[PDB]
Amino acid sequence: KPYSVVLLDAIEKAHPDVFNILLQVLEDGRLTDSKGRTVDFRNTILIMTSN
Amino acid sequence: FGRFTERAQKVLALAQEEALRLGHNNIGTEHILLGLVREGEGIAAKALQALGLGSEKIQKEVESLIGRGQEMSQTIHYTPRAKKVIELSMDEARKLGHSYVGTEHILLGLIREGEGVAARVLNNLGVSLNKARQQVLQLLGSNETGSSAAGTNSNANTPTLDSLARDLTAIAKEDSLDPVIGRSKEIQRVIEVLSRRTKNNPVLIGEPGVGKTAIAEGLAQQIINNEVPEILRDKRVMTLDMGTVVAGTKYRGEFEDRLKKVMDEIRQAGNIILFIDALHTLIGAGGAEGAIDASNILKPSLARGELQCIGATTLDEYRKYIEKDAALERRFQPIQVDQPSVDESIQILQGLRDRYEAHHRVSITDDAIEAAVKLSDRYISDRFLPDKAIDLIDEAGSKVRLRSFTTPPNLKELEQKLDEVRKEKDAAVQSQEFEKAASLRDTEQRLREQVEDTKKSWKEKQGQENSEVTVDDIAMVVSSWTAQTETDKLLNMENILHSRVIGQDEAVVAVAKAVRRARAGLKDPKRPIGSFIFLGPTGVGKTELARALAESIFGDEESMIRIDMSEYMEKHSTSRLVGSPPGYVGYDEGGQLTEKVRRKPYSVVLLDAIEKAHPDVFNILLQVLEDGRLTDSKGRTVDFRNTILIMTSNVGASELKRNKYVGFNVQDETQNHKDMKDKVMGELKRAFRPEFINRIDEIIVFHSLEKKHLTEIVSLMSDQLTKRLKEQDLSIELTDAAKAKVAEEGVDLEYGARPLRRAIQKHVEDRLSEELLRGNIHKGQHIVLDVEDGEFVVKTTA
Amino acid sequence: FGRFTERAQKVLALAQEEALRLGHNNIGTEHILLGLVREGEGIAAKALQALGLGSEKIQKEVESLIGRGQEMSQTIHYTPRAKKVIELSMDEARKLGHSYVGTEHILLGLIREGEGVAARVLNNLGVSLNKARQQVLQLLGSNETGSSAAGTNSNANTPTLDSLARDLTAIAKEDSLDPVIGRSKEIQRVIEVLSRRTKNNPVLIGEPGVGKTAIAEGLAQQIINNEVPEILRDKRVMTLDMGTVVAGTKYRGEFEDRLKKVMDEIRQAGNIILFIDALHTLIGAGGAEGAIDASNILKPSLARGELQCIGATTLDEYRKYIEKDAALERRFQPIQVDQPSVDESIQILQGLRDRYEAHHRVSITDDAIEAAVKLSDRYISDRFLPDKAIDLIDEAGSKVRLRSFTTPPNLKELEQKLDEVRKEKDAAVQSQEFEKAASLRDTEQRLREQVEDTKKSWKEKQGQENSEVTVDDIAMVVSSWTAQTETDKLLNMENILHSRVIGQDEAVVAVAKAVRRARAGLKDPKRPIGSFIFLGPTGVGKTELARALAESIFGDEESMIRIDMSEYMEKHSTSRLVGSPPGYVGYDEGGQLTEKVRRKPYSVVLLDAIEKAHPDVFNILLQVLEDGRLTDSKGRTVDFRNTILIMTSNVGASELKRNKYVGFNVQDETQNHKDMKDKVMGELKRAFRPEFINRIDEIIVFHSLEKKHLTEIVSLMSDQLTKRLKEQDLSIELTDAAKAKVAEEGVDLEYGARPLRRAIQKHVEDRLSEELLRGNIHKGQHIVLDVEDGEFVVKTTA
C-alpha cells in the first residue's frame, strides 16, 4: 500500500539512527530495504508524533 | 539473390537480358527459364537441351509474351514471380544437396513455381514440368568430397578405439582439426603432465568457458611431431567422449561399462593416452552430487600408471577429485588456463573485431579498443575483463554507423508522405477516378526515388565513418553504462561533485581530484579507487558527495552501497542494537558489507560512523583499505578493487560549520576558508585511529556554509523540491531570483543549514501550491516561483 | 601400426619388400596381398594357397602392375591404401578375438577394402573377395584359444553361485586375479575370524580406499594351502556381492530377497564361509537412515553359526553394528586396515615406478621416491601420503623428459614455410603452371625433410638427458604445486619473508629459520609446523609476515585462516559479536577454528590477540600447539599438522618502533636492535598467562622499521602501487631513485615505518595520477615515477 497514512509514533523514542531511516522517507519517500525493493511513500502521509 | 554460386546468379542475370531485349519490363519467370536454356553448359541449360528445349524453343514463346518490345522496360529488375522462382530454386538446392542455388536448381525452381511464366512457357512448348525437374536431377546427386583416409592406421588398438571415439590422432593425420586458442606454452606444460604415469594426468583448471578444449587438441599435434619426448611419440591419443557413450541405452550403468572397456584395453600400455573429459566427475569426489563413481576403476589405474590420461577439470573441480586419495592425489596436477586478464583481453577483442565488419564497422581503431578495455576495467566494470571491453568498442561501433544513416538526409519524412500517396493513389484508382489516381501515382513515384537517393547519399557518411570507433566514441559508450565521456567523468568531476555537494569547495575538489586521479588509473585500485575520510557536518555535502561519485564513476546516483557501521555498531549490545547469534562485526562481514559489494563490486561504499564504532571493525575496513578485498562469506573475495570507500568521522564538522567563520569580515572569513580545508584532516587523526586513515587515499574536508555556501544548501532543498513533482506531471523551479529570496530567510548565527528544507516548503512549495489549486495554472507546464519585484511571483513557461 | 602380432606386421613389411622389388614405390594393397600369400604357413598365406593363389599367382599380377620398376622405390613406405588395409585387418581381427592382429586378419583386411589394389589383383586372378575371407576364417577365425571350460566343480552351489557371484575359491584355483596389497598379518587375523562363528565376521575397517579387497583374497589362499584349522579344512568361500544383485532388479524388496537366498544355501553349515562385502551398508544402522537394513537376516544367521561370514564394515561402523544388539556384535569384529602411512608410501611409489616406464623419466631414483614422499608430507599435505608422493615423482618424471625434447631445433618455423609452399605449390599445380609448380613442389619436399631432421635432433638431447628425476626434480615439481628446490623455499625462506614484511629483520629470520627447521623435519609436525608468537605493532610487520609465510611454505599468500581469540573471550563480544543465546567461545570450539583448518590443514592459522583473550581459549590454544589437534565439532579432528599457528600479541611495539638508526648516536641504535629483538619476547610473558605461549616453538619479535628498513618497505608499497593499475591495463614503475624519495618519509627514531603506504599515496600514486588525469599520459601507456634531480619526475617511455 503506497497509499496509506503512515503513523510513526514518537520521536524522542526515535534515536537519530532511526531518524535517518525516517529522513529518507521524509525526503525521498523511499527506503530501499527488505530485499532491495523501493517502497513508494509518494502518497503516504507520514506523521511522526511527539508530546 | 544472396551469396550464391555463379550458376544461380548466372541464370538470373540472363533473365534480365531477355526482360529488356524482349521488352518485358519486369523480368518474369519465362526469362528465368530462358536464362537456363541460354547459358548453354549450365547444369540446367544442359538439362533443357536434353529435354529438347534449346534457346530457340523457349525464346519463341518469350517473344510471344513480349516481342521486341517495351524497351522503355520500366522496372527492369524482377517481378515477384521470378523472385519466387529464385527462393524456390533455393529450396530445390537445399533439396539437391547444394548450399546455394545453381543453374540446375533454378530449372528445378521453375517447376516449383507452377502456373507461373516459366511453367506456362513450358506447357505451351509441350514439356512436362516434372520431366524438366527430372532432367536436371539426373545430372545431380551422389555428392561426395574427401575421405581419402579414415580412422587410425595404427589400429591394433581396435576394441577400445572402435567404441568410442573420434580420437584426436585420427583428425590430425591430415589436418581438419581447429587449434583453437591458447595458452600455448601451456600445451607444452600439459604434455609435461602427460609424459608421466602417476602424475599421468594433466588436469586443466580454468573456466570452461574459456575454450579450454583447444589446449587438449594441442597435445595430439605435439605428441605426433615432434617437440615432445619419443615416449610420447610412442603414444596414441584415444578420446573418451562421454556424449557418444550415454546415447542409446541412456543409463549410468551404460556410461560406466563403456568407460570400463576403454580402461581394460589399455594393455596397449605405454603407447596409449586416454582423454577423460570431466575427470573430476568420474572420481565423483566431494559435493552433494557424487556424479558417477568411476573412481573405483580410475584409482588403481592412475596409481599403477596403466591409465595415463588427460584430465579436464575446473578451478575448483581438481580439488574435488584430489580430496579422495588415490585419485587426483594419484593423478591430477593443475595447469594454468586463463580467462583473459586485461592485456590478454585486448588480443581476444581484436581477434573477434572483424565480424562487425558485417556492420561495415570496427575493425579497430587501436585507441578505441584500449578505451573499451581500460575505462571499463576500472569503472563499471560490471562485466568480465575481455567481454566488457569488446562490447564497448562495438557499443560505439554501431552508434556512429547509425549516424551514417539515422541521419542521412532523413527522407524518412519523405517515406511518411509516400505512404499517404500510395493510399490516395490506390483508393483513387479503386474509385476510378482513373486520371484522378494518375497524379497521385506520379506524386508517389516522385517520393519513392527521393527517399532511395538520400537514404544512400550518406554513403558519403559511410566513407567518413565506417570503421572508426575512436577513444572518445568508446568512452561515451562506456559512460552509457558507467576517451571523451570517461575522461569527461574524470576531468569534469569537480563540476559534477559540486552540484550536489552544497558548499564545500573543500570537499568537492579533494574528492573530485582523488577519484579523478583514480578514474585516470593511478590512485589505488588494490584498495578502493578512493578510500576516504569525509569529515564535515551531515547533509551539508556528505551523503550527496557519495551519490555524485556513484553517478560519475559507476553509472547512476544510487550505484552507491551504504552501510552504517554504527547500526551494527559492534559496541551496541545484545540489548542496544540488533541481535542474532553472530552479532555485529559478524553481521557486517558475514552479511552486509560483503553482500552489498558482492552484488555490485564497483559502487561507492559509504560507511557511516567508524570513528568510534568499534576499533575491531576499523581493522576490517582497514583490510578493505589495504587489500582492496575482504574475504568473508566462507571465502568469497568481494572486490573493493573499484569501490569508493568513504568512511566518515565528521569531527572536522565544527570548523566547517565555522562557515569561513562567517561574519568575521569577508576577508578573514575568506582566509578561514583555506583554514578549514586544513583544520579538519588533523582533528580526524586525533579522534580516529591512523592505520585506517593511512590506507585511505585522501582526507576530505567538507565545508558547510560561508555566506555563499549556505545559499547552495538553500538551493539543495529547493532543488530536491523541483525534482520531486515531475513524477506526478509537474515541473516547478524556484527561480534564482526567488532562490535568493528564500535564502534571505536562512541566515542566523544561531542555526545551521538544516532548517532550509522546512522553509523551502513554506516559501516555494506552499507559495506555489496555494496558487495552482485555485486554478491559475494548468498542470504539466513549467512553473517558476521567481522574484520579479523583490517578492515571489509565480510565472509559467513550458 | 599399434601393438599387434608379428604375423600381421610381417605381411605388411613383405609389402615393402614388393615396394622395391617391383618398384611400386609406395606399397598398395597388392603388395600386402603378396605379403599374405608369400609367407607360406601363415593363416592368410595358407588360405590364399587354398584359393589357388601361390606367391607366384599374386606376384604375376603385381609384376604386371609395375614389375621392376623404380627399385629406388621413391618414398619406400606405405600409402593410404596399404595403411587402410592394416586398419581394416585390425577390425577383421577385432571380430575374431585378436587385438594382437595376425596374418589372417590382413587377408581378411584386404577383402574389406574392395576395389583396391589387393582386391583388383584378386578380381583379376579370378578369386572372389568373400571366398578369400571365408578361407581365412575357416582356418583362424574359429578361435577357441586357451580352453579350460571354467568353473570349479559342484552343483549344490546352484541357488547361491547362480545369483551372484564370482567366488574367491574360483579365482585362486588358477590364480586369475591380483592379490593386491596387504596387510598380511591381517589376512591371518581374518582367518582367525573364520575360525569362529559367534563373532563370525572379521570386519575390515579402514579407508575404502586402501584396496581392502586384497585381504579378502588372502583368506581363499590360506584356507587352501594348508595351515588353517580343522574348521577350515572343509571351508569354502562363497561371495555375496551387491552390485550384480541391484543391477537389472532395481528394487530394495527384491534385492533383500536375493540376499535371503544367499543366506539360505549356507545350510552346508560348518563347511561354508559367506563373504559380505559392504557389510556396513547391510547393517543399515549408525546413521539417521540405513543403506538397506539386511542386518535383521544376517544377525541371527551369524548367531546360529550356519552363516559365518567375512565382513567389510567401516572405521566407525564396526561400533555401529556392535551397538545394534544382541548378536550384532557376534557378527563384526575388527581388523586393522591401513591407508599407507609415509614409510609404506615410499614402498608404494617404488612398486609402481616400473609401470610408468613409458616415460623414461620414471624410471629412477630411490632419492626421487624419498623426495616425493617426504616433501609431500610437509608440503601439500592436502591429499594422502603415497598418492601425493607418486604424483611428485611423476610430476618431475616428465617435466624434465620434456626438457629433453622441448623442441628438437624448433623447425616448426620450417613447417610454417612448408605450409606456405603446400598452398603456393598446390594452387600452381592446379593451374599447370607446370614449371611454376615444379620449384614449388621442390620447395615443399626440400622443407619437409629439413623439418624432420631437426625435429628428431634432440634425440641427441635424449642420449644427453633421457632419464633424471632425482630429488631436485621432485622438489621443483612439489614447488610447482606449492628435496632440494622445494626445500629451497624453506632454506631461502628469510629472503622470501623479508620481501613482503615491513622490515622486521628480527621477525623474518626467526620465523623463516624456525619454520625451515620444522619443515626440514625437526621442530614438530604433530603440533603446528610452526607455533609462534608474533609480538610488535600490527600492520607494521606482523600480519604481512603471516601472509608471506603462507606464500613461501604453503604456496599461496592467502592460504591463511584467521580467528580472533579475544572474541572468544566475550570481552568485546558480549555486545559486539553476539546477540541471541549462542555466541563466541562456542564458535571457537564448535566450528570456526576447527572447520576452517580441517578444510585447509596447510594454512597459517592466525590467532589474533591472545593476551587479553579468554583464559579458557588458552587451554584450547595450548591443545592446538601441543597435541596438534583439537577434537571439537562433535568428534571432528582438526589437523594442525602442517598448519603454522601464529598467535599475535599487541605488546612489544615501542622498542620495535625504536630502530637501528644510522645516526642519533651510534650506541643505543645498534643496541635498540638488540633491545627490540630481546625485550619484546619478555613483554609477552609479563602481559599474561604463560602455559599456552611458552608451549609454542619460538617467540618472534616484529620491528616496525629498523632504519635500515624504510627503503625495503617503500619497495613493497611501490610493488602494490605498480600492480593495481595493470589490472586496468597500465604499466607504471617507480624507479629506485623515486622509491627513494618516498622512503625519506619513514626514516625515524620512534615512529616505525607504517606511514610509507600513505606517503607513496601522496607522492607517487597521487602525483602520477595528478599527471595522468591532466592528459599528459592517456589510457594505456607506461608511467615512470622517477627521481632525476633529487625530485620526482613523471616520465613516459611507451
Walkthrough of the structure:
The structure is cut from a larger assembly and holds 3 copies of chain A. Chain A has 51 residues and is α/β, with parallel strands linked by helices. Chain A is 24% helix and 24% strand. Chains in contact: A-B, B-C. Chains B and C meet through helix 9, helix 11, helix 16, helix 18 and helix 19 of B and helix 5, helix 6, helix 21, helix 23 and helix 25 of C. The PDB classes it as chaperone.
Entry keywords:
two-stranded parallel sheet; 6 strands; 24% strand; 51 residues; alpha/beta; 3 chains; 1 helix; part of a larger assembly
How many DSSP E strands of chain A?
6
Work out the helicity level of chain A: 10-25%
Instruction: Report the largest inter-chain contact.
Output: B-C, 124 and 112 residues
Number of helical segments with 4 or more residues of chain A: 1
**Secondary-structure element series of chain A:** EEHEEEE
Strand content of chain A: 15-25%
Strand order of the largest sheet of chain A: 1-5
- Shape descriptor of chain A reads globular
Kindly name the structural category of chain A: alpha/beta
Largest sheet composition of chain A: 2 strands, parallel
User: Between the first and last Cα atoms of chain A, what is the distance in angstroms?
Assistant: 28 Å
Radius of gyration of chain A (CA) equals 11 Å
Oligomer: part of a larger assembly
Region (Repeat 2) (chains B, C): 78-142
Domain Clp R (chains B, C): 1-142
Domain UVR (chains B, C): 415-450
Region (II) (chains B, C): 469-653
